């Protein structure tokens, strides 16, 4: 039977400060007991001040940032250049991991 | 959702139906009424799988209702017995089924009698002196063999269902917590709140 | 006959001309916009005496930051306020946050060209869509049966807006505060209405950024023009 | 005249009379005016107000990083032609990691108005479009009318007495093709050339919109005090 | 690409008149006669080989046509509309009745899926009706022999004998004169071959005439042995050979 | 009347008169041809300077189908682009169910059955462009030319628009003057001069010549543009010529 | 005065989009003719290549349908393209259907159905086409059967299309009458073509080169059509006697 | 488009009417008038046919009166085709009702289903509406005998005797001289008879020319049974009420 | 399907399938609406054209809705049912999810998004009715009544007038009608609209029906003799 998740592995790691935050991750990827790459950035830009990390299958992850990257740029869009907050960005989040609900994206999200 | 009776005696029809809502280990209500009026002189008491019961129950409820409006008349017991019967066999062979067992019991304004219908999942129809659904029916159908008469009155009606009652709480091993009984007759439906 | 979606000659879509027209018929709206809130105002025109006046509900909430003012077939309006509503309701739940007014606005004129042979006509009336966010603050915008929408400082539509806009024209100036703003829209209804104005034929509202979008009482709005009645009696 | 009723009617010279009516719109319009240098591109686009209450009707949009159009005529169709550029736009990057060509997309706007031509029910988009942009080959302009035609220029200019400024650019054309590596003498050009398309009114600070992008320059658009330099 | 005549071509005039149902009967009057008598044991039906050109082959253009073996029917009108409801008629036979009861139609229920298909054409949209008048004859075991008229309206009327077409009015007089209750199916042919011979100008013989009978069972037409209760088709068209024999006895 | 004012109603003539209607504006556009060679074909196009502000080389107007065929058209430039982009579809279903490229006549009709079906209908408009087109199959090198009715055959030469007559004429003498044929790079020259000659009926505006060709031997049977040196060959061929 | 624009009933009982589409089959200024041999049909129709431009031999208005069924049209070339298309479809799918090459005569019949369906049906128009299917049938034999705009088809023992169709069906009628015979008594398929090109140039009074004619010829198991230089041999035995 | 030859049959004139419904109406006054009387003890149903002639086969012949179910039948009056796809889906709907409340339909409900398909015609779809009107005989145990009217607009109404088709006007003033309330099923049969002898355009009326049928709780042990005339019957009546 | 705009707009601003819609409501049967201080009256003209009539079976002009709300109309017959069916539907289905009966004026606000929809779909006509809904809101003692028409607008009324010769009526009621003392009882009530009804029904009581609807679904109709009393207390008053 095909089986339509992986596990690449990793770890992340967000911490808040009092007028900053990071989101740390490893750069390792792997399948199994093999390393497919020594240095994959998990750890992403997404613009607006926003950073964004979904680890777990490596796939639904470059999925979904993919997505909300464009959400972000959509954003822009319809609402006039207006900064996308963490609080709304959340949310966007949310809808987006429970769109699919019954065919998940195999992935622990932070932002 | 455990425990329903009905008996047709001379004039009237009574429905006893257990007052228990079980969810898994605790038992979360002791004063559920697992009924609907119908209309006037029809009464429908169901058990089954949870939502399921109570969702077409209300959905049966909603188009006699809207049938008695649109026709200012009220359908017979036999004919809305018929209606539920297709809701039901239609049910069965859908993507999901409504798991709900029924018992309708009404007073036919027209015959002047009383009438009892029991309706399973599947649809199967039935009219009946006296009927139950589920594992009641295993104790309380001998019973009602044994003591039943068509010319009994709604007290005897009412003290044989206490004797059915009294066989259930001793031999069965669910605390169903009583049963909330209604007798439906010539002046409609009213509800014996001592049992 | 001919298509609904017909350009004329001018260029310009018939179908759409003709709503204005319709929109020309209709009771007057007026939105005058300040820094201490917007104020909508309407004529209820009612047909009958025996008509109970307080059910002519011709300003609408549609979120607590955003109000809505009619003028035309006023009918029409209601499939244009669900929408907004059901949008401004929507991005609240993708966004956890209030709706830019040019945002709702936008969603609302989009409906406005699906028509042809979607629905079988333009929508037969025009809307102030007043409101206040944290980016632009507060915000009056005029929404056509063409899609279309301006942002105005202030405007009238209905059956007396030109002769209101020409008013608003000499009146507006940006230090007008909201006390002033609700006595302007008054005396403008007043002068383009046909029926001497009152409680029970005119209805005020305004949306502040404290306390939100309210539809005016009939005894706040008498007092109003009570103040206004002594005040040109003033000079 | 009896071929005019809708656009699947050709006239007996071979006419399409509800694209020209649409094409009419365009010339009611507001000014608006496009053009290039070999770094940069430039739209500059006079907007109309309704009154003096009025705010002044935008005439800029941006569809991508690299690349947005000014309008002319029906804004809600703008509006509709824009949202489908920047869904294009934003294909070829998900899809393709690619920045759409400037050229291609102004295929792909000549093949979505042809559509509303040729078949009964619809109508011809009534607006007209400048694109710029920058793309793998540098500077581009493209002028969209929505009988389908999208033509790629050094400059031109669309709306009411667009003739003036579309004149001015045939004499500039030498000059300020050259303008490379300079975008405030780009639109000091372009705003230049839409003072030819005037009558009675000039530019204030918020009649006047400009956009400019490049070779180091996202597509941006400025309006209020930042066009008061220009002015 | 698109289909958008989804709204009726026939609609009913000031004065109550569905016009293209009387132009499609108008059509009908323009056609070539055709006639229907019925016997006490049989029906025929009749009608003329108008031949478009001599070098065509008339043969191979069939007027009168089987719909079940029990029952055929003849046409005044539009050919290519006739063709077309004889192939509709074959199948309606077949999916709303025989594939349901394991037999064929009877008579008037056949004549009553062909009214519909008419009717339809009178009221969907996009369509114009049928330009044809069927007479459909037939026999069932438990109405015995029959004759039906069916008009572009989709209205269907029995008849003991009837015309339609060219010559309808002076045919129908001719058989109003010769009809009785007693009649034999031979008598019925005979009576058949004299009022066609008055509506047809040129040639009158088996070549230019079709013929069909609803008659006795034919075992021999069958194909196969075997079966007692399959006793053969009652429908039979008359040959080119056996028309002629009956037009000497003329 | 009223015959003409519907599209797929037959006039009393037997005609169609939208579909003549959509013939006048191709006669209203720019010149375009197509010249069969030896071994390819070659298609020419007129394009009309309306300003110094075109880019010139920019605003392509030929265009190519799968790798092997080009097609050129006058008329109404969008109608074109549409029957390019459907002949694309056409071709690719094809190639992706048999394998071989499509061969030109079994391309060309692909284009004319579906012009032919905006004849059909009134809820559509016809076709408002000629189009010429052709390359090199498995065959040999083809040229026709398809019109706003779905007609369409094979050719020697094809011209349409504006110029057609005068180009017409050109053709008809390079057919006259070479029954063994004439070379690719011969086509090229010839295209360009009867463009150059046909422009007497455009020659208010000046305009861009733009020339492409298919041929066996010069391209690999592939569709490729005339860029360059070999362009500026033919225009100063053309040049000469005129002169 | 729609009823003359669309496919209902004008007052008359007539539909004159039908009519006017017979009309649209003239409009080549083209004339057909089919003859029967014994072991073969023979279809003959004018070329006109009046272009020197023109490619003549893409010119043509005679189509193989199938390997035994030949279609010659009379009437402009799309729709006799539209209505080849569709007969070659119809054709293969009903070969797939029931296992069996489709008959000439049933073709015909469907590719009629589908033209009364035009004369119906108001979005449709009428192909502007007169359809001649012809074949070497294997059950009837040599088979001729012609379909038109109002969806009318009958069988043939020879026919002619076009504008001087009348001329030609005379010339035809009278040798029919002499020989009273349904067909050409001829053994080769050649002759029946000399025959087919003779006849025609006595009925239109007009001599014929290779390039003027196109023909067609169907025997038992295909249908095909004759080259230029075919045509010449068929020319010079035709002046040689 | 197609625009160009659409009719629009859904509309209203500037007057509020329904063009087509009114046509409609002006179609069905030319057709053979059939009268419904109402008694206590019964209903009768009578109806004049159209086509007079001598080779018409009576006996198997049915333009006018149809039956819906063992209860309900109907007299139709306009386009007898349009009348039978009515027809067919009103037994449909009647059978439906059965199926469901295991009840035969009460008349009313299966007179309004009907109503409501024919009102459809005239709001939405584009289609011509049904060129009919019906007269609705039938019984059931809440109103006993009804008689209903239906036409083309969809519109129904009651009736105690009523006419529709060919000279209603001159048809429902002697209904309206000679009813009375206590009036029985044999005296409605002959009033019936009377009210076509004297509104019919033909010369003299005949058995030939007459569908004939009554609805009677008259059958053995309080049933009701449907009678619809063979033409023997309706000349037997014709002769017992003096009309020929 | 079907979708040719019908309803559509003409150079003046009007549309006119709207407006004929509403001349169809004009050659209705006049209803009327009356409402007291705790009941409401719903009048009814029936046209006396019409005898030999079977009243028991016949299409009562009011029509229950639910058990507290009715609807009255003046129009096309055929197209009321599809409204009323519409909102029996709808009352049952708020029942359902809500659990409380419907409001009246969210009953009439149904109705007219129902009239609305019908003036901007394609393929369709508008409704040829205007209707009167009355009734009372659950656990509720003030009396509602509303008013709908083609083009879907809806109001409230203290009393109203629609369909033939409503505008005389309406006059009746304007000035016999007072908002500071309305119909303090059942008769009061009931007597203004007979009232009302005989300014232009001019026939005695067969033409005149009344529904009273009071609190808590307490929905009576009266029958002829009942009315006919009224009749005759209204014109030996009316003899002086
Ligand atoms: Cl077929």
Not at chain 2, 131 to 145: E, K, N, P, Q, V
Not at chain 8, 54 to 81: F, H, M, P, R
Request: charge should be negative; hydrophobic fraction near 35%; charged fraction near 25%.
């Amino acid at each position: 039977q095909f089986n339509p998740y992986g596990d690449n592995g990793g770890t992340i790691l967000g911490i808040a400060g009092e007028d900053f935050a990071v989101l740390a991750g490893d750069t390792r990827n792997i399948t199994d007991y093999s390393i497919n790459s020594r240095y994959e950035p998990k750890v992403f830009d997404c613009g607006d001040n926003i950073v964004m990390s979904a680890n777990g299958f490596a796939a639904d992850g470059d999925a979904l940032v993919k997505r909300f990257k464009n959400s972000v740029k959509w954003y822009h869009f319809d609402h006039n250049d207006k900064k996308l907050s963490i609080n709304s960005a959340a949310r966007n989040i949310q809808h987006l991991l429970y769109g699919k609900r019954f065919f998940p994206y195999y992935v622990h999200t932070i932002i | 959702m455990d425990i329903i009776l009905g008996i047709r005696v001379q004039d009237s029809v009574i429905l006893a139906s257990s007052k228990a809502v079980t969810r898994g280990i605790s038992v979360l209500k002791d004063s559920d009424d697992k009924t609907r009026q119908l209309s006037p002189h029809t009464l429908m008491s169901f058990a089954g799988e949870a939502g399921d019961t109570v969702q077409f129950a209300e959905y049966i409820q909603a188009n006699i209702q809207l049938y008695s409006i649109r026709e200012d008349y009220e359908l017979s017991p036999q004919a809305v017995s018929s209606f539920v019967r297709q809701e039901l066999a239609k049910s069965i062979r859908s993507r999901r089924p409504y798991q709900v067992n029924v018992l309708i019991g009404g007073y036919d304004k027209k015959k002047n009698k009383p009438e009892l219908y029991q309706i399973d999942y599947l649809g199967t129809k039935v009219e009946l002196p006296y009927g139950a659904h589920g594992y009641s029916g295993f104790y309380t159908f001998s019973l009602l063999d044994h003591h039943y008469r068509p010319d009994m009155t709604t007290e005897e009606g009412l003290d044989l269902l206490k004797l059915c009652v009294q066989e259930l709480e001793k031999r069965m091993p669910m605390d169903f917590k009583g049963v909330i009984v209604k007798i439906v007759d010539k002046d409609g439906i009213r509800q014996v709140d001592d049992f | 006959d001919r298509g609904v979606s017909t350009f004329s000659p001018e260029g310009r879509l018939f179908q759409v001309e003709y709503s204005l027209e319709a929109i020309k018929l209709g009771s007057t709206a007026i939105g005058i916009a300040t820094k201490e809130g917007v104020v909508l105002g309407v004529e209820k025109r009612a047909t009958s005496p025996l008509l109970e006046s307080d059910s002519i509900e011709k300003i609408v909430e549609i979120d607590r930051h955003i109000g809505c003012a009619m003028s035309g077939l006023t009918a029409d309006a209601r499939s244009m306020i669900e929408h907004a509503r059901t949008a401004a309701v929507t991005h609240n739940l993708y966004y956890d946050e209030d709706i830019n007014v040019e945002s709702l606005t936008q969603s609302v004129c989009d409906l406005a060209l699906r028509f042809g042979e979607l629905m079988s006509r333009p929508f037969g009336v025009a809307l102030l869509i007043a409101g206040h966010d944290a980016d632009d603050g507060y915000q009056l915008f005029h929404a056509e049966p063409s899609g279309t929408f301006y942002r105005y400082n202030a405007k009238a539509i209905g059956s007396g807006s030109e002769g209101a806009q020409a008013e608003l024209l000499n009146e507006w100036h940006s230090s007008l505060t909201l006390k002033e703003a609700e006595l302007l829209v008054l005396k403008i209804l007043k002068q383009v209405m046909e029926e001497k104005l009152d409680e029970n034929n005119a209805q005020l509202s305004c949306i502040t950024k404290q306390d939100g979008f309210k539809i005016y009482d009939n005894e706040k709005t008498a007092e109003l023009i009570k103040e206004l009645k002594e005040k040109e009696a003033a000079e | 005249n009896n071929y005019d009723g809708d656009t699947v009617t050709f006239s007996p010279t071979g006419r399409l009379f509800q694209v020209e009516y649409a094409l009419e719109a365009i010339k009611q319009g507001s000014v608006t005016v496009g053009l290039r240098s070999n770094t940069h591109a430039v739209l500059v686009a006079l907007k109309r107000n309704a009154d003096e209450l009025s705010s002044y009707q935008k005439k800029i949009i941006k569809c991508d990083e690299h690349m947005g159009l000014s309008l002319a005529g029906l804004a809600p169709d703008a509006r509709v032609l824009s949202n489908y550029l920047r869904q294009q736009c934003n294909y070829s990057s998900l899809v393709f990691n690619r920045k759409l060509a400037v050229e291609r997309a102004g295929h792909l706007l000549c093949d979505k108005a042809q559509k509303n031509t040729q078949s009964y029910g619809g109508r011809p988009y009534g607006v007209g479009l400048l694109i710029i942009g920058y793309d793998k080959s540098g500077a581009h302009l493209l002028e969209f009318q929505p009988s389908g035609n999208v033509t790629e220029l050094y400059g031109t200019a669309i709306g009411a007495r667009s003739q003036g400024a579309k004149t001015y650019l045939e004499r500039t054309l030498d000059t300020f093709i050259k303008i490379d590596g300079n975008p405030d003498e780009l639109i000091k050009a372009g705003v230049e050339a839409i003072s030819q398309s005037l009558r009675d009114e000039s530019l204030t600070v918020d009649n006047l919109s400009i956009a400019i992008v490049g070779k180091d320059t996202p597509f941006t658009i400025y309006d209020g005090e930042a066009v008061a330099k220009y002015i | 690409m698109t289909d958008r005549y989804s709204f009726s071509l026939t609609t009913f005039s000031p004065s109550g008149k569905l016009g293209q149902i009387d132009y499609a009967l108008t059509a009908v009057k323009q056609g070539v006669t055709s006639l229907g008598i019925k016997a006490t044991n049989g029906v025929v039906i009749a009608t003329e080989k108008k031949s478009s050109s001599p070098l065509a082959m008339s043969e191979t253009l069939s007027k009168v046509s089987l719909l079940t073996p029990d029952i055929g029917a003849v046409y005044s009108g539009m050919g290519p509309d006739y063709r077309v409801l004889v192939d509709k008629s074959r199948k309606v036979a077949h999916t709303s009745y025989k594939r349901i009861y394991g037999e064929y139609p009877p008579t008037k229920l056949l004549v009553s899926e062909v009214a519909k298909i008419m009717q339809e054409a009178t009221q969907s949209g996009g369509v114009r009706p049928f330009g044809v008048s069927l007479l459909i004859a037939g026999h069932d075991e438990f109405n015995g022999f029959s004759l039906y008229q069916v008009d572009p309206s989709g209205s269907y009327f029995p008849w003991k004998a009837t015309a339609i077409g060219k010559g309808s009015v002076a045919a129908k007089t001719f058989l109003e004169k010769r009809w009785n209750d007693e009649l034999e199916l031979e008598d019925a042919i005979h009576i058949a071959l004299l009022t066609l011979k008055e509506s047809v100008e040129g040639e009158f013989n088996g070549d230019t005439i079709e013929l069909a009978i609803i008659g006795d069972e034919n075992p021999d037409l069958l194909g196969y042995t075997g079966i007692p209760t399959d006793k053969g088709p009652r429908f039979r068209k008359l040959t080119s050979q056996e028309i002629n024999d009956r037009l000497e006895a003329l | 009347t009223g015959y003409d004012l519907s599209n797929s109603v037959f006039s009393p003539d037997g005609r169609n008169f939208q579909v003549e209607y959509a013939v006048k504006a191709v006669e209203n556009g720019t010149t375009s041809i197509g010249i069969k060679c030896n071994d390819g074909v070659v298609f020419a196009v007129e394009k009309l300077i309306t300003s110094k502000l075109l880019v010139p080389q920019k605003n392509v107007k030929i265009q190519v189908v799968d790798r092997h065929i080009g097609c050129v058209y006058s008329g109404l430039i969008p109608d074109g682009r549409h029957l390019v982009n459907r002949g694309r579809e056409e071709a690719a279903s094809f190639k992706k169910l048999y394998k071989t490229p499509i061969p030109i006549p079994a391309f060309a009709d692909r284009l004319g059955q579906y012009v032919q079906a905006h004849t059909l209908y009134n809820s559509v408009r016809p076709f408002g462009v000629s189009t010429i087109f052709g390359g090199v199959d498995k065959n040999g090198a083809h040229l026709y030319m398809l019109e706003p009715s779905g007609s369409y055959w094979g050719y020697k030469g094809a011209a349409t628009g504006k110029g057609r007559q005068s180009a017409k004429a050109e053709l008809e003498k390079l057919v006259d003057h070479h029954p063994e044929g004439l070379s690719a790079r011969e086509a090229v020259k010839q295209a360009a001069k009867i463009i150059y000659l046909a422009h007497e009926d455009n020659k208010e505006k000046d305009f861009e010549l733009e020339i492409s060709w298919c041929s066996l031997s010069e391209t690999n049977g592939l569709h490729k543009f005339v860029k360059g040196d070999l362009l500026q060959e033919a225009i100063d061929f053309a040049q000469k010529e005129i002169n | 005065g729609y009823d003359r624009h669309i496919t209902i009933f004008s007052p008359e009982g007539r539909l004159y989009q039908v009519e006017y589409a017979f009309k649209a089959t003239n409009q080549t200024n083209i004339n057909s003719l089919a003859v029967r041999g014994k072991d073969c049909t023979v279809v003959i129709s004018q070329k006109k290549v009046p272009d020197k431009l023109l490619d003549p031999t893409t010119v043509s208005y005679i189509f193989c349908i199938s390997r035994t069924i030949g279609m010659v049209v009379n009437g402009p070339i799309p729709d006799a393209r539209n209505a080849a298309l569709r007969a070659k479809a119809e054709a293969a799918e009903f070969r797939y259907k029931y296992g069996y090459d489709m008959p000439c005569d049933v073709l015909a019949k469907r590719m009629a159905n589908l033209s009364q369906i035009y004369t119906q049906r108001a979005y449709m128009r009428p192909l502007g086409v007169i359809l001649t299917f012809v074949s070497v049938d294997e059950e009837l034999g040599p088979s001729i059967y012609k379909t038109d705009p109002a969806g009318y088809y009958v069988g043939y023992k020879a026919t002619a299309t076009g504008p001087k169709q009348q001329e030609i069906t005379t010339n035809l009628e009278n040798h029919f009458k002499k020989s009273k015979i349904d067909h050409i008594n001829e053994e080769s398929w050649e002759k029946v073509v000399e025959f087919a090109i003779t006849h025609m140039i006595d009925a239109l009074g007009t001599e014929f080169s290779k390039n003027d004619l196109e023909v067609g010829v169907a025997t038992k198991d295909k249908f095909f059509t004759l080259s230029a230089e075919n045509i010449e041999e068929r020319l010079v035995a035709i002046a040689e006697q | 488009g197609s625009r160009r030859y659409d009719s629009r049959t859904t509309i209203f004139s500037p007057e509020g009417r329904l063009y087509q419904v009114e046509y409609a109406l002006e179609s069905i006054s030319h057709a053979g008038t059939a009268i419904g009387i109402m008694a206590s003890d019964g209903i009768v149903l009578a109806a004049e046919r159209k086509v007079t002639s001598t080779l018409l086969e009576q006996d198997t012949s049915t333009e006018k009166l149809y039956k819906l179910n063992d209860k309900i039948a109907v007299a139709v009056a306009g386009l007898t085709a349009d009348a039978e796809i009515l027809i067919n889906t009103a037994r449909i709907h009647a059978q439906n009702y059965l199926k469901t409340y295991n009840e035969d339909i009460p008349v009313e409900i299966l007179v309004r289903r009907l109503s409501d398909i024919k009102q459809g015609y005239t709001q939405h779809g584009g289609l011509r509406p049904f060129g009919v009107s019906f007269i609705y005989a039938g019984y059931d145990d809440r109103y006993g005998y009804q008689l209903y009217t239906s036409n083309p607009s969809g519109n129904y109404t009651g009736w105690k005797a009523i006419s529709v088709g060919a000279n209603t006007s001159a048809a429902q003033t002697l209904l309206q001289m000679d009813y009375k309330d206590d009036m029985k099923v044999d005296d409605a049969i002959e009033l019936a008879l009377k009210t076509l002898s004297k509104t019919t355009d033909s010369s003299a009326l005949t058995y030939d020319r007459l569908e004939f049928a009554t609805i009677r709780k008259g059958a053995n042990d309080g049933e009701v049974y449907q009678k619809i005339f063979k033409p023997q019957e309706i000349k037997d009546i014709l002769v017992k009420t003096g009309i020929t | 399907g079907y979708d040719r705009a019908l309803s559509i707009f003409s150079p003046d601003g009007h549309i006119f399938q709207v407006e004929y819609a509403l001349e169809a409501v004009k050659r209705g049967t006049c209803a009327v609406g009356v409402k007291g201080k705790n009941c409401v009256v719903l009048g009814c003209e029936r046209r006396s054209t019409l005898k030999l009539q079977d009243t028991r079976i016949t299409p009562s002009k009011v029509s229950k809705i639910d058990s507290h709300v009715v609807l009255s109309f003046s129009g096309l017959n055929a197209d009321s049912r599809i409204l009323i069916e519409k909102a029996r539907v709808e009352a049952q289905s708020h029942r359902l999810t809500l659990e409380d009966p419907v409001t009246v004026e969210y009953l009439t606000r149904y109705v007219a998004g129902v009239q609305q929809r019908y003036t901007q779909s394609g393929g369709v006509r508008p409704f040829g009715v205007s209707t009167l809904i009355a009734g009372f809101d659950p656990r509720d003692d003030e009396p509602k009544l509303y008013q709908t028409e083609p083009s879907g607008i809806y109001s409230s009324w203290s009393a109203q007038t629609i369909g033939r010769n409503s505008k005389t009526v309406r006059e009746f009621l304007e000035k016999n009608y007072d908002r500071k003392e309305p119909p303090a009882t059942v008769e009061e009530c009931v007597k203004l609209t007979v009232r009302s009804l005989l300014e232009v029904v001019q026939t005695g009581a067969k033409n005149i029906e009344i529904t009273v609807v009071k609190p808590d679904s307490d929905i009576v109709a009266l029958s002829s003799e009942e009315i006919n009393q009224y009749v005759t207390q209204i014109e030996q008053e009316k003899q002086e």
